[PDB]
Amino acid sequence: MKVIQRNCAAYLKLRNWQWWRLFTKVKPLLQVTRQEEEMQAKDEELQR
């Protein structure tokens, strides 16, 4: 709970900082690492 607590309190401190909307609009664009990791995850999922 204290782990989750520190995490959500940091989120609270950060959910309102203006930079967040800005740099979160851009993350879904670049996904090359995401593309590769999802490739391998789907590989193991299909094997299972």
Binding site: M1, C8, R15, W17, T24, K27
Partner: protein
């Protein structure tokens, strides 16, 4: 400091540094938000340039997002702590249960936390709350 985090931060930076000079200026975020939608008011841009000691350089925003972020934990250990937290292990605890526990879990918590959580979480119509995707949202899976 985390390899994945630093690599994705510098990736997004060199993608947004439309001048490739390593110096973030009003041009970059301005035209980026213009392509996204309504252009940002230059006072917002100046306030975002007020944290860095000048034109936001690479290590500049590196250190700023570090000092603003170092201390959190990835969604993996988040949902790990969430797993034993529920006996059903399906990730469908109730939000009012979250309220009754947050008020005194370790240190005492107030009401702003729970009201902001409920107003910014996909809670069902009786209290049940799902974190399989909400925690990933907290780590920016969808938002």
């Amino acid at each position: 400091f985390d390899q994945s985090q630093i690599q994705e931060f510098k990736e997004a930076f060199n993608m947004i540094d439309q001048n490739r000079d390593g110096f973030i200026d009003k041009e970059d975020l301005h035209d980026m938000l213009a392509s996204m939608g309504k252009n940002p008011t230059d006072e917002y841009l100046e306030g975002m340039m007020s944290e860095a000691p000048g034109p936001i350089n690479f290590t500049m925003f590196l250190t700023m997002f570090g000092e603003k972020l170092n201390g959190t934990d990835p969604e993996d250990v988040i949902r790990n702590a969430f797993a034993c937290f529920d006996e059903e292990a399906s990730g469908f605890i109730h939000e009012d249960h979250l309220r009754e526990l947050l008020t005194t879990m370790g240190d005492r918590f107030t009401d702003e936390e729970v009201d902001e959580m409920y107003r910014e979480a996909p809670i069902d119509k009786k209290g049940n709350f799902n974190y399989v995707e909400f925690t990933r949202i907290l780590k920016h899976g969808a938002k």
